[PDB]
Amino acid sequence: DKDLLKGLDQEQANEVIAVLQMHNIEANKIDSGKLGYSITVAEPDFTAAVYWIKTYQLPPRPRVEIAQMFPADSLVSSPRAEKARLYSAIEQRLEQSLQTMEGVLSARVHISYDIDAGENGRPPKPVHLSALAVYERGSPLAHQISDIKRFLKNSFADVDYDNISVVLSERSDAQLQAPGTPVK
Amino acid sequence: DKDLLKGLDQEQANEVIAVLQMHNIEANKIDSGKLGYSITVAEPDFTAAVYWIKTYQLPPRPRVEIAQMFPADSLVSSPRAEKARLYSAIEQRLEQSLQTMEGVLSARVHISYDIDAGENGRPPKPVHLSALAVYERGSPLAHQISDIKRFLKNSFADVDYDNISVVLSERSDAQLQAPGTPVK
Amino acid sequence: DKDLLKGLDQEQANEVIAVLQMHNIEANKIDSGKLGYSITVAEPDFTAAVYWIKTYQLPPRPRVEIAQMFPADSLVSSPRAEKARLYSAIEQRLEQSLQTMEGVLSARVHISYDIDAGENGRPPKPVHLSALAVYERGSPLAHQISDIKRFLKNSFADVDYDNISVVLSERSDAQLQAPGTPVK
Amino acid sequence: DKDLLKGLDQEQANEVIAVLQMHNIEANKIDSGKLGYSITVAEPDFTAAVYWIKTYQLPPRPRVEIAQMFPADSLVSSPRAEKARLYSAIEQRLEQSLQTMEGVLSARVHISYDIDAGENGRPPKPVHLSALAVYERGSPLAHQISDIKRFLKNSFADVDYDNISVVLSERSDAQLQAPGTPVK
Amino acid sequence: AELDSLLGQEKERFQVLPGRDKMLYVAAQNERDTLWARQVLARGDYDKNARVINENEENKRISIWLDTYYPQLAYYRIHFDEPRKPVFWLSRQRNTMSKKELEVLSQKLRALMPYADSVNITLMDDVTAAGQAEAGLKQQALPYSRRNHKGGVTFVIQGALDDVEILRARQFVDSYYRTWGGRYVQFAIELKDDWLKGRSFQYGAEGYIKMSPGHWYFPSPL
Amino acid sequence: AELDSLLGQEKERFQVLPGRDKMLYVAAQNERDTLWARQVLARGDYDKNARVINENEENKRISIWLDTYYPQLAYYRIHFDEPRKPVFWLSRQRNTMSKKELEVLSQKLRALMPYADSVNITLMDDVTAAGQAEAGLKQQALPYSRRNHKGGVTFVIQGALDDVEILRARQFVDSYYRTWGGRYVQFAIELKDDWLKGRSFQYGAEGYIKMSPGHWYFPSPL
Amino acid sequence: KIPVTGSGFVAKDDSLRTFFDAMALQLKEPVIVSKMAARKKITGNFEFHDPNALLEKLSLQLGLIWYF
Amino acid sequence: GSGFVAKDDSLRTFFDAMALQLKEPVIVSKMAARKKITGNFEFHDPNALLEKLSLQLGLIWYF
Amino acid sequence: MDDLVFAGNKALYLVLILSGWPTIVATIIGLLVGLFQTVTQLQEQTLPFGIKLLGVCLCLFLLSGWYGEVLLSYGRQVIFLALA
């Protein structure tokens, strides 16, 4: 009943619980009001749980977006801080536009940033895109790489089919059964 | 009865319920007044619901629009901010005018953002569109793609019939029966 | 009787009920003063009503017009914002004039925004229109597509007959019978 | 006694009543003092009243004129705003004068908007007009299309008979009998 | 409570057939009315076992069985204008089955649908199926291109079509697919712009494209 | 409590089969009803032993077993339209097994599936499986490029296809893999940027000569 | 890394001076292209197996005169 | 068979396409290279097409 | 001539907001030196000139980068409309 993490977040504690339940140890989410959450495991299951905290880098950091480092409420807005705030909202809207396809659970899109072509007389370079995806199993995951490339091809000015890269995979096996209490 | 999420919005809570009922587990929605909602499930259906929270990336984020990164409260407005606030309103009016067709349940339209032509000495490039749609089943969804292209062709200045890409699918099987309470 | 939506608007609550009554479940609208309406369904229809909320993306958002992004209450306005408010007032006026024809129930008109024509020495481009319509059944709607094209042709400066695309469709079958209460 | 719309306006309730009474259901108009009017229907015709609200888009919204987008109480007034607040008054004065012909019940006229003709060194473009009308039945409505075109021909500088389009129609069958109370 | 009273007021848009395997089949007419009667059996206000049938779903259900136990079979559609005697349309110029084999096919297809009484198999001609498709495509004044090949024909409708020739072709293809099935003859409404948009070319067996007044290009013979 | 009452309301999407090894197998149809019937057996509201089977995954479990005890076997697919009696679609022109050892193969396949009663082995032809795949690929008006080799056919679909040709090719490959399985014939749909969809020519002194299919493609200036 | 099995010259926007230099091993004499005829360009896949007939066909299609 | 589809050419790129059917090279002068022509053309009798097109356009030729 | 007045009216809008924020910080601290002397008056008139100078040059330092961004953006827009 020795505690190991406290003051967590609502989105963090469900990830620490979902990782520990995969490795046959149970955890308990104890609310504390103003301070936060806490996670307590049993006494013989403390040695294994510290090793999976160290391995999985828990707790997870909050996810970083490029528009967070040039805030709109700041008193400065350079043209670099506008071309980097527009591109950071397009690759978030494309990722939310990718979760509504047939059989996709998660996706992540990266745009290549060019910022100083408009300052100088040289023309801008071509645009490169890259995307990851996680599909539900039972899907023939060799054939869905052309529907995403057709969707991403003309959502920009002029990209080719060789400057887009989609790397997708199927999800892991489901964890449906309960872990179990250590009999002592 | 162990809770797993709390402080949620109404629109997030209805989608968490509609996802957990897909996987044969029963959830309860508890209103807490000012503090929002909370989703509590039973005891044996906890080890599966914490797995589907991590898998489906729940709770869902609010959907992002491009017109949120350039608010109108700024005293000055660059032409890049004015042309991006205009394109981010055509991007929502076209998808609000696609749901009133025959058979469409949901849609999502994307316009290519060209920003540097209005300030440099360079001529503007062409404009590209890309749309997704979800149709009610029993539809000839190959013949229903040749009037969305006709609809999107002359809603802009000069697009071609190969600069528009439509990736549409049919809806899933309906979930009509109740989950079933966990007996023990 | 469990609730699924609250804090709504008078226009939104009359559309959630109309979606639910199409799929053979009965809802009850409850007024709550200044706190909006609320919609309650029975107990066994709860599993299906969340499925049609998730599918139809209910509640609907308020419809967006282009003149909302450029308010007239601002002090100084660019010509790029005045021409965009002019084309958005013409675009709503042609839509409100199309509903008074013979047999039209609803209509929606879109228009090309040539916003960077007067800034440089290039000539302004031709303009494009695109309209949708829903007709009352019992009409041979193949011959109704040329009167709207003749009406929209010389309502602008210089359009051609292949820069206008009309995609119209008959309405769905009527719903006149009661849903029916579940027995208990 | 179930309400479906409340807080309506005076000319809004005569539109909702005239739509519901066309489809054999009977409504009741109740005042509320400062809150405006309200419309209730009976119990066995509640499903049809919701269906004809959704189909016909009731309640109606105030008609849009171009002079509401360029108000007269502004401090500055560009020549584009002065040139469009003048087109928007002949646009709704020819509509007022078309109603005094022999047989016409309603009409709507649109004019092509030319703004950048006077700014630069190009000559002005030709003017294009379009009009709709609803005639009382029993009229030879094909011989009445050359009098609207003759009246519209020399109300501007120089238009041709190939730049004026009139699309008109006869009214529906007259509704005189009462709907009828639902017996049970 | 009877099932005829558990549905809506209009007792004509559905049809209840007492099955042979101690069940009760409800015959709807489309997909909007199919979910109207699936909500009744799924929310639980009926005691015995019942099933909902359609015409497209029941044609796709016993088409999986003819891809496993009777492969390389030539047929068109199963018509349910009276649900007690379905009509099976078999191809005449592409089969080699005798009278006994058509009887054992009717007796093995009768057991899949327990609500029916006797499936009636009739042999449709093959040249009339493409004659009604070409004479229907010529009445609407549509440009097309017929590609005859082995075991099916193909009509290709391409080019830059306007808004009236889309609507006049969408009303003919749905009325032909409804009565003949998409098994033998298939249409391809491929709407695209003019290929080689503004380029002058010299067509026929030795072809080139002029990308510019001073630029030649020699791809496949245009 | 019986097993067929712990499942959903409609007793038509599941089917309980008694096992020979004192178990009880539930035969679902797809992954959504498989996870529906596995949440029941995983939360633990049942006393005896039970299993969940599936058409897509118990063909893969039996093909892992088949390629360690019977290598160099030519087969296509196991079909489960009657789950108490499956059919094994064996090839004919690529294996040399007699009748007495086809009896041994059927007796060893029966012991792997304790829910079955008799596995029926039939010999499908190897030529019609590829002729159906080509007669259906020509009917959809698709550009393709056949690459025949010994012990396998492959179809390559390259080029800048549009949306209709992508949706028709994806619906044809998904409707073919369910019937035959990708053991003998394989498709290679990919998207490059060239307006000539796969085919390429060289030009000298006589006209055009069709080049051999290779991996390098000419990028299209257009 | 240069994959074609056979022989031939693939030209991508060559400017008729670097194009006829590639035909100067099959035509076994050096080629001299003038200055006004060095502004036209050509692209495609070519194959020289009788270049005296390929030059005769191409000088008529492009519009050229030559002398040996 | 053969033919040329002209879309806003300049009377020099048009007459070089006929320089294969005619077995001689064609030399178009400078003032006659300003007029333009467009439309589908077919070359099956080019000597009669040169005599008819040089009169409808206004041209003189010499072989 | 509609952009001829628009470029002029932008400048009269621009001197307003560019000058208001340094004037109000020369007026709030001038009110604050006068509010404090309701008790312990002890006034000499040349005392708060230095505090007024440190007030405006502090708010000029904090608002310096925004002053350069607005003056460069208005500089770029007027010569894009002049040349094009």
Instruction: Give the integer Cα–Cα distance in Å for G52 and G27.
Output: 7
Give me the domain span that covers residue A36. Answer: 1-60
| CA angle (F89 as vertex; F86, F93 as ends), nearest 5 | 160
What one-character DSSP code corresponds to residue D35?
A: G
Resolution of the entry in angstroms: 4.1
Task: Report the alpha-carbon distance of residue C66 to residue C80 in Å, rounded.
Answer: 13
Cα–Cα distance, G17 to G21 (Å, whole number): 6
Residue E115 in tokens: 């609500």
Q: Do A177 and F42 touch (CB under 8 A)?
A: yes
Neighbouring C-beta atoms of residue A165, cutoff 10 Å: 13
Going from N- to C-terminal start, the domains of chain E cover 1-53, 54-124, 125-194
Residue B165 CA: distances (Å) to CA of B65, B146, B150, B159, F166 = 21, 11, 12, 12, 11
Please enumerate in sequence order all residues whose Cβ is within 8 A of that of F182, keeping only pairs 6 or more positions apart, or say none: none
Q: Let me know whether D30 and D84 are in one domain.
A: no
Residue showing tokens 């009462």:
D178
Query: Rounded CA gap, I73 and A78, in Å?
Result: 9
Token pair, residue A24, equals 């046959």
Residue to mutate among C74, C76, C82, with most I CBs inside 10 A, is C76
Q: How far apart (Å, rounded) are the C-alpha atoms in residues I65 and E125?
A: 84
Question: Which residue, among E218, E144, E222, has the nearest Cα to E185 in the 3D structure?
Answer: E144
Backbone CA torsion sign across G2, G4, G5, G9: negative
Q: Looking at the structure, do residues D137 and D161 belong to the same domain, yes or no?
A: yes
Q: Using the Cα atoms of residue G12, residue G17, residue G22 and residue G27 in order, give the sign of their dihedral.
A: positive
State which residue of chain G sits closest to E221, comparing Cα positions: G44
Distance CA D108, CA C60 (A): 31
Q: Please say whether the beta carbons of F222 and F190 come within 8 A.
A: no
I69 contacts chain A (CB < 8 A): yes
| Cβ contact, residue pair E173, B140, below 8 Å | yes
On whether residue A79 sits in a domain, the answer given is yes
**Looking at the DSSP assignment, which residues form a beta bridge with residue F89?**
F77, F122
- How was this structure obtained? cryo-EM
Residue D34 CB neighbours (<10 A): 4
Mapping DSSP to helix (H, G, I), strand (E, B) and coil, where does residue I24 land? Answer: helix
State how far residue C143 is from chain D, nearest Cα, in angstroms. Answer: 14
Q: In this structure, is residue D75 part of a structural domain? A: yes
Q: How many helices (H) does chain B have, and how many strands (E)?
A: 4, 6
Indicate the residue of B50, B63, B122 with minimum beta-carbon distance to A17.
B50
Strands (E), chain A: 3-6, 28-31, 37-40, 104-111, 129-135, 164-170
> Is residue B130 in a domain?
yes
* Identity at C133, one-letter amino acid code: A
Residue G21 identity: D
Give residues with Cβ within 8 angstroms of D97, minimum separation 6: none
Nearest to E50 by CA among E70, E26, E72, E28: E26
Of how many residues is chain C composed? 184
Q: Token pair of B9, please?
A: 């919005």
Q: ∠D53-D58-D64 over CA atoms, to 5°?
A: 160
d(CA A93, CA A109): 9
Contacts of A106 in chain B (CB under 8 A): 57
HSE-up (13 A, CA, CB side) for residue C139: 17
Exposure class string for D157-175: b at 16+ Cβ within 10 A, else e? eebeeebbbbbbbeeeeee
> Measured between alpha carbons, how far is D34 from D31 in angstroms, rounded to an integer?
9
Among the partner-chain residues B146, B161, B174, the one whose CB lies closest to the CB of E193 is B161
Tell me whether residues I66 and A78 touch, CB distance under 8 A.
Answer: no
Rounded Cα distance between E168 and E162, Å, is: 10
Alpha-carbon span A16 to E188, nearest angstrom = 53
Q: G37: buried, middle or exposed (CB in 10 Å: 19+, 13-18, 0-12)? A: middle
Cα(C118)–Cα(D122) distance, integer angstroms: 12
d(CA B80, CA A143): 39
- At E181, give phi and psi (nearest 5°): 80, 155
The answer to whether residues D126 and D45 belong to one domain is no
The topology (CATH level 3) of E1-53 is Alpha-Beta Plaits (3.30.70)
Query: Which residues have CB under 8 Å from E160's CB, separation 6+?
Result: B161, E191, E192, E193, E194
- Cα separation, A139 vs A153, in Å, equals 23
**Of B71, E146, B30, A160, the residue nearest F220 (C-alpha):** A160
Please identify which residue in the block is written with the tokens 């995403």. A148
In contact, B24 and B54? CB cutoff 8 Å? no
CATH among 3.40.47.10, 1.20.58.1910, 1.10.10.10, 3.30.300.170 for E54-124:
3.30.300.170
Nearest-by-CA chain D residue for I3: D78
**Residue B169 in 3-state DSSP?**
strand
B91 is written with which tokens? Answer: 């991007």
What 3 state SS string does B52-105 have? HHHHHCCCCCCCCCHHHCCCCCCCCCCHHHHHHHHHHHHHHHHHHCCCCCCCEE
| Nearest CA distance, A131 vs chain F (angstrom) | 16
Question: Helices (DSSP H) in E34-147: which residue ranges?
Answer: 34-43, 56-61, 99-110, 127-139
Residues 6+ apart with CB under 8 A from A108: A95, A131, A132, A133
Take residue D39 and report the two structure tokens written for it.
């419309």
**Phi, psi (degrees; rounded to nearest 5) at A169:** -150, 170
Last residue of a domain, one of C38, C60, C82: C60
For tokens 């749909």, name the residue. Answer: F189
> Is the minimum CB–CB distance between A78 and chain I shorter than 8 Å?
yes
Instruction: Give the DSSP H/E element, type plus range, for residue E1.
Output: none
Q: Are strands F201-203 and F185-189 parallel, antiparallel or unpaired?
A: unpaired
Q: Which amino acid is at A98?
A: L
Number of folded domains that form chain A = 2
End-to-end, the C-alpha distance of chain I in Å comes to 14
Structure tokens at I9: 């009216």
Q: The sheet that has B37-41: what strands, in order across it? A: B2-8, B37-41, B27-31
Q: Which residues contact C154 (CB under 8 A, 6 or more apart)?
A: D112, D128, D129, D130, D162, D163, D164, D165
Same domain for A67 and A156? yes
How far, in Å, CA of F73 to CA of C72, rounded? 78
Check whether the bond before B59 is cis (ω within 30° of 0). yes
Residues from chain G that touch F204, judged by Cβ atoms under 8 A, are 8, 46-49, 54
Task: Note which residues in 172-211 of chain F have CB less than 8 A from chain G.
Answer: 200-205, 209, 211
Concatenated DSSP letters of D74-125:
-S---HHHHHHHHHHHHTTTHHHHHTTSSSEEEEEEEE----STTTSSSPPP
Q: Is residue D24 part of a domain?
A: yes
Contact I73 B75 (CB under 8 A): no
Q: Which class for F150: exposed (0-12), middle (13-18), buried (19 or more C-beta within 10 A)?
A: exposed
Please state, in angstroms and as integers, the Cα–Cα distance from residue F127 to each residue in E149, F72, F133, following that order: 18, 19, 10
Pair (B67, B128) in one structural domain: yes
- The answer to whether residues A49 and A132 belong to one domain is no
CA–CA gap between residue E120 and residue E85 (Å, rounded): 7
Other Cβ atoms within 10 Å of C74 Cβ, number? 12
CA distance C45 to C28: 12
Q: What are phi and psi of D170, to 5 degrees?
A: -90, 155
d(CA F78, CA F179): 10
- Whether the CB of C22 is below 8 Å from some CB of chain E: the reply is yes
d(CA I66, CA A74): 10
Instruction: Tell me: do B41 and B79 sit in the same domain.
Output: no
Please state the separation of Cα F197 from the chain's center in Å: 27
With 0-12 / 13-18 / 19 or more C-beta atoms within 10 angstroms meaning exposed / middle / buried, residue B86 is buried
Question: What's the sign of the alpha-carbon dihedral I52, I54, I55, I56?
Answer: positive
- Classify E143 as helix, strand or coil: coil
The answer to whether F10 contacts chain A (CB < 8 Å) is no
Q: How far apart are CA H28 and CA H35, in angstroms?
A: 12
The first and second tokens of residue F123, run together, are 């010999």
Q: Tokens representing D69?
A: 């987008």
Give me the helix-helix angle, E127-139 and E164-180, nearest 10°: 160
Instruction: Determine whether the interchain pair C93/D163 forms a contact, defined as Cβ–Cβ distance below 8 Å.
Output: no
Q: Is E27 helix (H, G, I), strand (E, B) or coil?
A: strand
CA atoms of B84 and A86, how far apart (whole Å): 8
E201 DSSP 8-state letter: B
Cα separation of the two ends of chain B? 14
User: Using the beta-carbon criterion (under 8 Å), do F205 and G8 form an inter-chain contact?
Assistant: no
Is omega for the bond preceding A59 within 30 degrees of 0, making it cis? yes
* C-alpha distances in Å from residue A110, one per residue of A144, B57, C91, C109: 19, 19, 36, 35
- Under an 8 A CB cutoff, do G60 and H26 touch? no
Distance of CA B73 to the CA centre of its chain: 27
DSSP chain C: --EEEES--HHHHHHHHHHHGGGT--EEEEE-GGG-EEEEE-STTHHHHHHHHHHHTPSPPPPP-GGGTS-TTSSS--HHHHHHHHHHHHHHHHHHHHTTSTTEEEEEEEE----SSTTSSSPPPPP-EEEEEEEPSSS-TTTTHHHHHHHHHTTSSS--TTSEEEEEEEPPPP--S---PPP-
Please say whether the beta carbons of E41 and F9 come within 8 A.
Answer: yes
* Best CA proximity match to E113, nearest among E53, E163, E170, E183: E53
Residues D80 and D56 in one domain: no
Say if CB A128 and CB A101 are below 8 A apart: no
Q: How far apart are the C-alpha atoms of C165 and C149, rounded to whole Å? A: 8
Q: For residue B19, what are its two tokens? A: 């996802």
| Cβ–Cβ contact H16 with G under 8 A | yes
Distance of CA F66 to the CA centre of its chain: 16
Cα D50 from Cα A8, distance rounded (Å) = 48
Question: First CA to last CA across chain D, in angstroms?
Answer: 15
Q: How does DSSP assign D39-64, residue by residue?
A: EEE-STTHHHHHHHHHHHTPSP-PPP
Contact H42, H17 (CB under 8 A): no
Q: Which of A60, A82, A100 is the last residue of a domain?
A: A60
State yes or no: cis peptide before C59, omega within 30 of 0. yes
Q: Best of B2, B3, B54 to disrupt the A interface by mutation (most A CBs within 10 Å)?
A: B54
Decide if C63 contacts B96 (C-beta within 8 A): yes
Cis peptide before G51 (omega within 30 of 0): no
Q: Which of F205, F209, F216 sits opposite G57 (nearest CB)?
A: F205
Candidate from G4, G12, G54 with C-beta closest to F205: G54
Q: How many residues does chain H have?
A: 63
Q: Are I78 and I44 in contact (CB under 8 A)?
A: no
Residues D14, A9: Cα–Cα separation, whole Å: 55
Distance CA E8, CA C90 (A): 46
The span from the CA of F3 to the CA of F209, in Å, is 68
Query: Going by DSSP bridges, is the β-strand pair F51-53/F24-27 parallel, antiparallel, or unpaired?
Result: parallel
Establish if B75 belongs to a structural domain. yes
Q: Looking at the structure, do residues D92 and D53 belong to the same domain, yes or no?
A: no
**Interface residue I84 vs chain D (CB under 8 A):** no
* Residue after which a domain boundary falls, among B9, B41, B60: B60
Cα–Cα distance for residue pair B10/B174, rounded to 1 Å:
23
| CA-closest candidate to residue B168, choices B152, B150, B145, B147 | B145
Residues B53 and B67 in one domain: no
Do I2 and D76 make contact, defined as CB atoms within 8 angstroms?
A: no
Residue D182 covered by a domain: no
Q: Is residue D181 part of a domain?
A: no
* Residue F19 token pair: 């096992």
* CA D57 centroid distance within chain: 15
Report which residue type is found at A34: K
3-state secondary structure chain F: CCHHHHCCCCCCCCCEEECCCCCEEEECCCHHHHHHHHHHHHHCCCCCCCEEECCCCHHHHHHHHHHHHCCCCCEEEEECCCCCCCEEEEECCCCCCCCHHHHHHHHHHHCCCCCCCCCEEEEECHHHHHHHHHHHHHHCCCCCEEEEECCEEEEEECCCCCHHHHHHHHHHHHHHHCCCCCCCEEEEECCCCCCCCCCCEEECCCCEEECCCCCCCCCCCC
Does residue D138 form part of some domain?
yes
CATH topology match: F1-53 vs F125-194: yes
Residues in I closer than 8 angstroms to C78, CB to CB, are 6
Contact A105 B48 (CB under 8 A): no
Cα four-point dihedral sign F30, F33, F37, F38: positive
- Amino acid identity of residue C60, one-letter, is P
C121 and C46 fall within a common domain: no
Give chains near C: 3+ CB pairs under 8 A.
Answer: B, D, E, I
The closest of A136, A122, A134 to A167, measured between CA atoms, is A134
Q: Do E191 and B161 count as a contact with CB atoms less than 8 A apart?
A: yes
Question: From edge to edge, which strands make up the β-sheet containing E15-18?
Answer: E15-18, E24-27, E51-53
Query: Do both C12 and C65 map to the same domain?
Result: no
Residue B106: CA count within 13 A, CB half-sphere: 19
Neighbours of chain B (3+ CB pairs under 8 A): A, C, E, F, I
Rounded CA-CA distance D134/F38 in Å is 65
Distance from CA of I5 to the nearest CA of D (A): 8
Q: Does I50 touch chain A (CB under 8 A)?
A: no
In chain C, the N- to C-terminal Cα span, in Å, equals 13
In this complex, the residue of E212, E214, E218 whose CB is nearest that of residue G44 is E218
For residues B171 and B106, give the distance between their C-alpha atoms in angstroms, rounded to a whole number: 10
Task: Tokens for I59, please give them.
Answer: 């708010």
The arrangement of secondary structure in E125-194, i.e. its CATH architecture, is 2-Layer Sandwich (3.30)
Q: Which two tokens stand for residue B59?
A: 């709770």
Provide CB contacts within 8 A for I39, sequence distance 6+: none
Q: Which of B15, B82, B89 sits opposite C54 (nearest CB)?
A: B15
Quick one: A40 exposed, middle or buried, by C-beta within 10 A (0-12, 13-18, 19+)?
Answer: middle
Return all residues near B16 (Cβ < 8 A) that are at least 6 apart. B5, B8, B27, B39, B58, B59
